[PDB]
Design an enzyme around this catalytic site. Structure first.
Site, mmCIF file in Angstrom:
data_model
loop_
_atom_site.group_PDB
_atom_site.id
_atom_site.type_symbol
_atom_site.label_atom_id
_atom_site.label_comp_id
_atom_site.label_asym_id
_atom_site.label_seq_id
_atom_site.Cartn_x
_atom_site.Cartn_y
_atom_site.Cartn_z
ATOM 1 N N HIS A 190 0.858 -1.216 0.000
ATOM 2 C CA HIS A 190 0.000 0.000 0.000
ATOM 3 C C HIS A 190 0.886 1.254 0.000
ATOM 4 C CE1 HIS A 190 -3.472 2.489 0.779
ATOM 5 N NE2 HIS A 190 -2.872 3.015 1.836
ATOM 6 N N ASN A 215 -2.573 9.313 4.038
ATOM 7 C CA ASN A 215 -3.134 8.139 3.387
ATOM 8 C C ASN A 215 -4.222 8.600 2.384
ATOM 9 O OD1 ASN A 215 -3.663 5.386 2.936
ATOM 10 N ND2 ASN A 215 -4.057 4.876 5.113
HETATM 11 O O1 LIG Z 1 -3.493 -2.020 -3.825
HETATM 12 P P1 LIG Z 1 -3.982 -0.834 -2.585
HETATM 13 O O2 LIG Z 1 -2.966 -0.926 -1.150
HETATM 14 O O3 LIG Z 1 -3.932 0.493 -3.266
HETATM 15 O O4 LIG Z 1 -5.370 -1.272 -2.083
#
Ligand SMILES: O=P([O-])(O)O
Ligand SMILES: O=P([O-])(O)O
Ligand SMILES: [K+]
Length: 256
Positions: A190, A215
């Site tokens: 992520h 985030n």
């Molecule tokens: O692949 P993700 O961590 O952007 O959900």
């Protein structure tokens, strides 16, 4: 007073900074953090070169790419691909021209209209890969140097891209109001951004330091979409919470 020096950097507290005007976004239920974290790094790089805090279209990047069709919602990509997409197209529309909705990830790449603004106008990717990356585990025995590298880039570029394991921030009582004391994993999944740092005194009365991390889970999650995390974490961690950092090497002229 000042908002970004070698000990303390928090541009969010300065309502006058270009960077403080880049609102938190929500990737929704697609694996598109690679787009949000990468475009935000470009957005801060632009702020530092004197441009407006205009948001890049994440949907354009999700939907416009060369080669065979891909599942752009179920499969995450990397910051290397954000750059690959720029270099192929030479155009980054503003969010307002083609706004993000996760259920639209997968749509045909839209035709660029005359009235769309180009947020990469006059941008150049420097030679020789176009980015620089660092692994925390390679600095296990000189963690100071890793911290220094990240602080310098946050100061100069406004942010870095960082990779974490998402599970590490899904603690059942995760509270955005606390400095998290977290371990990392051998791998990551992520993309987030480190956007600042400072010192604090922990619950044991010990001097410690934290990263401020942005985030892309919306402004409700964490502390208005951000959180603080101890730079070192628990003594027992084998792996640092920050698995990797990526910095883009871009030449943008001072303008707008
Ligand atoms: O692949 P993700 O961590 O952007 O959900
Ligand atoms: O949880 P660990 O693998 O960082 O010790
Ligand atoms: K772990």
């Amino acid at each position: 007073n000042m908002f970004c020096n070698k000990e303390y950097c928090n541009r969010l507290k300065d309502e006058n900074n270009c960077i403080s005007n880049l609102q938190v976004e929500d990737q929704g239920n697609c694996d598109t953090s690679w787009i949000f974290a990468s475009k935000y790094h470009l957005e801060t790089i632009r702020c530092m070169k004197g441009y407006e805090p205009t948001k890049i279209s994440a949907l354009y990047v999700a939907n416009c790419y060369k080669g065979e069709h891909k599942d752009r919602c179920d499969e995450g990509s990397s910051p290397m691909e954000f750059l690959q997409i720029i270099e192929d197209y030479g155009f980054l529309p503003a969010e307002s021209n083609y706004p993000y909705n996760y259920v639209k990830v997968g749509e045909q790449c839209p035709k660029v209209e005359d009235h769309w603004m180009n947020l990469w106008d006059n941008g150049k990717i420097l030679h020789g890969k176009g980015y620089t990356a660092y692994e925390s585990e390679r600095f296990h025995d000189n963690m100071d140097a890793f911290v220094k590298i990240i602080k310098t880039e946050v100061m100069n570029k406004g942010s870095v891209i960082a990779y974490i394991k998402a599970e590490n921030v899904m603690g059942y009582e995760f509270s955005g109001k606390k400095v998290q004391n977290l371990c990392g994993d051998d791998t990551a999944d992520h993309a987030v951004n480190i956007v600042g740092y400072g010192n604090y005194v922990n619950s044991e009365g010990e001097k410690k330091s934290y990263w401020i991390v942005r985030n892309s889970w919306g402004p409700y999650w964490g502390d208005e979409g951000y959180f603080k995390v101890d730079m070192y974490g628990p003594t027992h961690c084998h792996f640092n919470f920050i698995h990797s950092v990526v910095i883009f090497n871009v030449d943008l002229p001072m303008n707008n």
